[PDB]
Amino acid sequence: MAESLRSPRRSLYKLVGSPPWKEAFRQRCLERMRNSRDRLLNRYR
């Protein structure tokens, strides 16, 4: 379904195709924080 990115032809060859892990950690921590906040908010119902 398309997706990905149109990288220049130089780096498009034999690529690993993995996003940097450091930026993924921040998004994961944000999702964890949101889930924990929702789970704590559920305690009043």
Next chain:
Amino acid sequence: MELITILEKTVSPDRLELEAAQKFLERAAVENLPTFLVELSRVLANPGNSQVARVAAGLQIKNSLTSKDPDIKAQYQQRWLAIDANARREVKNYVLQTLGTETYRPSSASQCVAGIACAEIPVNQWPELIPQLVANVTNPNSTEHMKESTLEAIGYICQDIDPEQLQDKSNEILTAIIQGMRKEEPSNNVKLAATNALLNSLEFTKANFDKESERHFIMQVVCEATQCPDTRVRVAALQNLVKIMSLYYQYMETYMGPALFAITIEAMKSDIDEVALQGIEFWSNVCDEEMDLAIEASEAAEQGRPPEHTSKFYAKGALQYLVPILTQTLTKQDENDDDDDWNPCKAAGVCLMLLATCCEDDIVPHVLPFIKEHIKNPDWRYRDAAVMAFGCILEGPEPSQLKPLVIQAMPTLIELMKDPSVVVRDTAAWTVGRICELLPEAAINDVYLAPLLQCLIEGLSAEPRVASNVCWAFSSLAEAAYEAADVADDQEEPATYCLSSSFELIVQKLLETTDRPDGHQNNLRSSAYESLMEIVKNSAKDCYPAVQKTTLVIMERLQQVLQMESHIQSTSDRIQFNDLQSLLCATLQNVLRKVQHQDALQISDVVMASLLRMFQSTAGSGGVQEDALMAVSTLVEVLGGEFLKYMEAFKPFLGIGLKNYAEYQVCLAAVGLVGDLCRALQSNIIPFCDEVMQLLLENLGNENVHRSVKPQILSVFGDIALAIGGEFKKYLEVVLNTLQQASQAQVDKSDYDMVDYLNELRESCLEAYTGIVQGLKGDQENVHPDVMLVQPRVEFILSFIDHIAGDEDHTDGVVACAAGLIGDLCTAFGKDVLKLVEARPMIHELLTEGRRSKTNKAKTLATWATKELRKLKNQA
């Protein structure tokens, strides 16, 4: 340099003498720009000026008015402009014969004249350069030196200045340049120069292409320029057919078929590398454009409006001519190569990969027989071609059709991974990695999973070229096995795991491969550590003792780095040890989050000690503190209320982190730690919260932080209000006014990035208010009397949410947060909010549409809000 000096260069050229004479240049001549062009403008017109001296003059002239940074020489342009009472008008008399003189190269004099002319054109007070150049394109003598130097100067001018400037005489320049584009000139180099100049003039010629009268002749001339004997004008002509394609796709239907089709196919069929490479580039660009057009058409269909750019499907129209010649190109693999030069076969591979995505499922019939037949050829060239091509077509067609091929080709690939050649094994590893990464259902079958795992673990000890793929082949496979768990009834964890029996051996082999003496090749060590993190992340309920052993080993490795962290000799030491420490901290976090609650107690002390000792680092640097802050942000959550003992020593380092606004990366991590993560201390942070609130207010005052810090601060305010609950007095008046003032900020619709940024600010303030109200009310059934201090503010909150509801560029989440903020006001008071709401029914739109929202959070919050409201209005 000077007229006196340049004649000395003609007699005795040198290297040190020229540098010695150049010392006075920047002292006097650069400052004394007036009456300095005059001496340089009386030498290189003379045929007696030798090449070696004229080049040594042109180089220094070009250095004087060209630079890597434009503005520092735009100052020189301004200084030159004030002298135009003589400037450029005296050198008019010089350039007319400086061209095309002495040795048969432009001698960089044309590059100097390009400086003057690109300096003039921003002011456009002296257009007379245009006739000065175009006069000698149709001149009776037309000596090749003059014509070629003139067209080279025209190219320089077209490629140097901002494209918008040259539109004043575009039509004349276009009419002139095509005159030199004809083969009728006996000189070959003039054709080269004319073709080069046209390439750079395409930037601003838009007004000419947009009407057919000239464009038909232009396309005829350009296409006929491809049927030429010289290699340089062939490659340049094809290089001008490309980047014409990308710029003017819309008009191509009259030219592509009759003219471009045959020449581009013959180009791809060319034996010499250059022409085939240019043809590959052309047909890659056309399918890139068709992919973008398909994306736009899909967007238009989603919106329901007809597309504004109908596609012609050039790439999809012709496949039977493309695939066979493409595959045959892969057979011409260089036996020995550095794997860095852009060989034609690599371009063919990437072109076929793009073709797979653009053509989708129609590529399979044309490429399948080659893959099936040449896979077992005794010639290693054809085996490499068959394996390399098969891995390129994985994207595109749906997995349903591609499944049987993978199923019946898997046995071949495993035995293909061992081969006397090396490139065959490399491409087999690449193919199997992409197969397991893109088609999990094909690699999850147990018919060959055990041989596959055995071959992978045996190959993990091979060269880095294949090891770097075996890592990231283990990943996206462990995750698929975790997702495909045989039973996942409870949300906690899968009870069993397809890799369970081999899991401990996999972990041991990964640990052994991590510390290989060749881990830096192809970033093998980082890939291995990432694969290990993904392995630990998706661990089963079973195999926990393997995680325990991994914890012990990784803790041994974590403290081991602390010695070389000090024993630094070079910047590369810092680079490597920073990367190693970051990976170690990430793996320690990921492995701590998995172990049992009881097991973390015996390790928490050493973990915290090592973390605090590492936190000193370089006395402060964004590359180190972030990892420690994330690690603590995980330890405090996993450990729970026992963190009280460690807090006393840690809090001054947290007070260092909070004030690090010069590096926003540390700031957001520290704020997140201060938030719900440190909130686990419950009603014990009260002694510590005062300086925390002070520092947060200071971070709210200083307007130097990144734009994303503010929502986190508001969320921390809300979490603190929830945590403390009944002792926010003497603090609420300090933050309520700040958030009130902040919330009224506005930004227009010129960029949707600002739209969703404002949306985040809105929701962060909304949830801060929800947290404040919940904390003030408390968990008691009765309402605490201290909540009366927020009563006079409620109508502003309702007006704020109504102002949110006035705009319609919503997204998910804000509606749920609004429902949450409205669903507790009724519980707080229950007698007045029932008559503030009904005066402005706009929130009923949010409530009623929330019942049908596309996310669970919004649906649940809107249902709860509607039930809360309806059960209070009935009492009337």
